[PDB]
């Protein structure tokens, strides 16, 4: 799996052990191994949400399955909860886009995982 | 909605409001409130089009529903448009993805659109 | 063609004229003309993969048509390839994305692909 998330939160607010922690909350939650897990956070960014530039976060979420209406649902509790307590983002002002990758459209290892 | 523009424009091109008018702009053409519009402005990019390194974005509009042959035409006029106008780049040095997501993969405020 | 690389490898790593070679070898691969290129690289990036901050890669590939388990096997052979040649990236420390886009879903010149 592989998560993203933009924010214009700074670098600095970035607490340390965050990558680590995210890395370990999706292991447990899409219940694949933390080896196959990437995460990748970028700061100070130029972005605005509802037409205002308090803290806000765009992210995604892409798996090889274990996407679906109950799994978003408890992902997004999982993830807007991080940024909120870690990054002090509003959870209404979080959007998480989820894709449900085939294993053939995703390139590791000089081949995919098909 | 969520619009991304990637581009190798610098920082100091990009005009003060630009923000602003992508979410009013964009409220209008999607039909959508502005308070559901995010917008999302990288400027200073390493990238090429074509092998050229002269000015050209790479661009995203993620939104539920509002997405298709004619709405995308356009929304491809518009948002070129403005690229132009505002940022300085030529219209046929701008790529712009659309995809439309279901409610169920789109996460916001601890839970799902769905 | 549209590749984008985000990587943790710092900028001064990432060799002159490799721009030019990813869109070169990306319009070899893919058979589509070199104008329809466009390549994008993210270096000095806050990622992890599998937990560690070792050299890693997440990227994208969102193609009109030219994307299958085959071709798709092809390109990340070429490019986990040039990944490991120029930015010294393990290639069982890259994921891609690939993305086979309708040509209505992308914008371009003011209009769409249809």
Not at 33 to 55: N, T
Request: charged content about 15%; glycine content about 8%; proline content about 7%.
């Amino acid at each position: 799996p592989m998560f993203i998330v933009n924010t214009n939160v700074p670098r600095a607010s970035v607490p340390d052990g965050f990558l680590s922690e995210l890395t370990q909350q999706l292991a447990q939650a899409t219940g694949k191994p933390p080896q196959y897990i990437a995460v990748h956070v970028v700061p100070d960014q130029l972005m605005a949400f509802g037409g205002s530039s308090e803290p806000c976060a765009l992210c995604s979420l892409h798996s090889i399955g274990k996407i679906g209406g109950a799994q978003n649902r408890s992902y997004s509790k999982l993830l807007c909860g991080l940024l909120a307590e870690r990054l002090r983002i509003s959870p209404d002002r979080v959007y998480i886009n989820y894709h449900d990758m085939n294993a053939a459209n995703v390139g590791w290892n000089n081949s995919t995982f098909a």
